[PDB]
């Protein structure tokens, strides 16, 4: 069976409404293929300095009759350095009316993130370790696994439709696919890590020139922009006219002139002949002050974030270890089938 869930385009992130507890407390949480844990902002949390973290729903464990404490510490650090911490528990999770019982989640009492995060990646990427390198609580069934085990979906799989850059909403379908929302055929690509939702990216064609890559790229709904290894990003920046700026002690970001020509397209070539094309508007990110970030940035990690993913329809299949991709077709027409 399938569960369609609306994605709110928040700007940097895409979020959905998900209820927790016996009393179905609504949380608005980021849908994140790049992490694997579902955590919620406790109503008694302390937000980090400068962070409005209690405006997107909060969770009061003491008002849920079904909340169970697991007696284990939770800590996570994300790629941008933000963190959350709390403790592990289990409770009922409800997604567009469909409830799963005894779902392990983290009750977060301190965070520098604006809202909770629903991590839907592989169980092997759960944040269950401490800074010593020891595992402090075991790996567990995260939301997609539990949806399968409780009979709500047939297969641990979900389709991602972020929709166009201007769209207010997109859709994630757990256990289904909307065959109206792409052109060509969905091409299954093998996932290249047992822990991360990466597929092999063969090359990037930018301003008409090919740049060979040949390494995995994380298809991360929870990243705003696109990240490449420093050397490769610098080659692309030399072609694009982007400028590397030291913005803090150990952070560097590419900027680009806000009036840059964005008439062209950037092409991403994957396995089995698959290609995704991205309009170049996606690489000029307005800062609102007459400066613009480039949509590609340096990192040790390769990540194709939302500025890529808006242009693909993706069927992530965590049971098969494939991600099937096709050029998106923006349409309200819908032809949904279970997977």
Partner 1 sequence: VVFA
Smaller CB separation from partner 1, 53 or 188? 53
| Vertex 117: Cα angle to 116 and 121 (nearest 5) | 165
Q: Which stretch binds partner 1 (CB under 8 A): 54-62, 247-255, 259-267, 299-307?
A: 299-307
280: Cα within 13 Å, side-chain hemisphere: 18
Query: Of 192-231, which residues contact partner 1 (CB under 8 A)?
Result: 220-224, 227
Q: What is the DSSP letter of 328?
A: B
Q: Which stretch binds partner 1 (CB under 8 A): 93-101, 132-140, 174-182, 298-306?
A: 298-306
Dihedral sign of CA atoms 269, 275, 277, 282 in order: negative
Active-site hit among 107, 220, 238, 250: 220
Q: How far apart are CA 153 and CA 6, in angstroms?
A: 17
Query: Is position 79 an interface residue for partner 1 (rule: CB under 8 A)?
Result: yes
Smaller CB separation from partner 1, 57 or 222? 222
- Contact with partner 1 (CB under 8 A) among 76, 106, 296, 323: 76
Q: Is 331 helix (H, G, I), strand (E, B) or coil?
A: coil
To 10 degrees, the CA torsion angle through 60, 137, 219, 217? 150
Residues for the chain: how many in total? Answer: 339
Q: How far apart are CA 261 and CA 280, in angstroms?
A: 8
| 220 counts as catalytic | yes
Query: Of 29-68, which residues contact partner 1 (CB under 8 A)?
Result: 30, 32-37
User: Least Å distance between CB 309 and partner 1?
Assistant: 11
- Contact with partner 1 (CB under 8 A) among 44, 62, 63, 80: 80
Active-site hit among 32, 37, 107, 178: 32
User: How many residues lie near partner 1 (CB under 8 A)?
Assistant: 28
User: Least Å distance between CB 77 and partner 1?
Assistant: 7
Q: Tokens 């790629």 — which residue?
A: 79
Q: Which stretch binds partner 1 (CB under 8 A): 79-87, 89-97, 199-207, 252-260?
A: 79-87
> b/e per residue, 198-224, with b = 16+ CB within 10 A?
bbbbeebbbeeeeeebeebbbbbbbbb
Site residues (vs partner 1, CB under 8 A): 12-13, 30, 32-37, 76-80, 82, 117, 119, 125, 127, 220-224, 227, 299, 303, 305
Tell me the catalytic residues. 32, 220
């Amino acid at each position: 069976d399938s569960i369609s869930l609306s994605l709110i385009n928040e700007g940097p992130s895409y979020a959905s409404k998900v209820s927790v507890g016996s009393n179905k407390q609504q949380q608005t949480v980021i849908i994140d293929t790049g992490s694997s844990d579902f955590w919620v902002v406790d109503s008694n949390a302390q937000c980090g300095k400068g962070v409005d973290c209690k405006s997107s729903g909060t969770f009061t464990p003491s008002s849920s009759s079904s909340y169970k404490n697991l007696g284990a510490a939770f800590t996570i650090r994300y790629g941008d350095g933000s963190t959350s911490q709390g403790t592990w528990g289990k409770d009922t999770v409800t997604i567009n009316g469909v409830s799963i019982t005894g779902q392990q989640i983290a009750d977060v009492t301190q965070t520098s993130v604006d809202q909770g995060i629903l991590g839907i990646g592989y169980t092997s990427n759960e944040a269950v370790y401490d800074t010593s390198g020891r595992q402090t609580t075991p790996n567990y069934d995260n939301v997609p696994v539990t949806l399968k085990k409780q009979g709500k979906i047939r297969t641990n799989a979900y389709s991602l439709y972020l929709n166009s850059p201007s769209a207010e909403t997109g859709t994630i379908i757990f256990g289904g696919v909307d065959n109206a929302k792409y052109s060509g055929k969905l091409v299954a690509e093998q996932v290249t890590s047992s822990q991360a939702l990466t597929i092999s990216l063969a090359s990037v064609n930018l301003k008409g020139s090919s740049f060979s890559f040949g390494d995995g790229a994380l298809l991360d709904s929870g990243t705003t922009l696109t990240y490449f290894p420093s050397d490769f990003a610098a080659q692309l920046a030399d072609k694009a006219g982007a400028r590397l700026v030291q913005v803090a002690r150990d952070q560097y970001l590419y900027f680009i002139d806000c009036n840059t020509d964005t008439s062209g397209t950037t092409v991403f070539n994957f396995g089995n002949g698959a290609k995704i094309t991205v309009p170049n508007t996606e690489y000029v990110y307005q800062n609102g002050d007459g400066t613009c970030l480039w949509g590609i940035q340096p990192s040790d990690d390769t990540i194709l974030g939302d500025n890529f993913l808006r242009h693909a329809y993706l069927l992530y299949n965590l049971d098969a270890n494939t991600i099937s991709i096709a050029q998106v077709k923006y349409t309200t027409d819908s032809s949904i089938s279970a997977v």
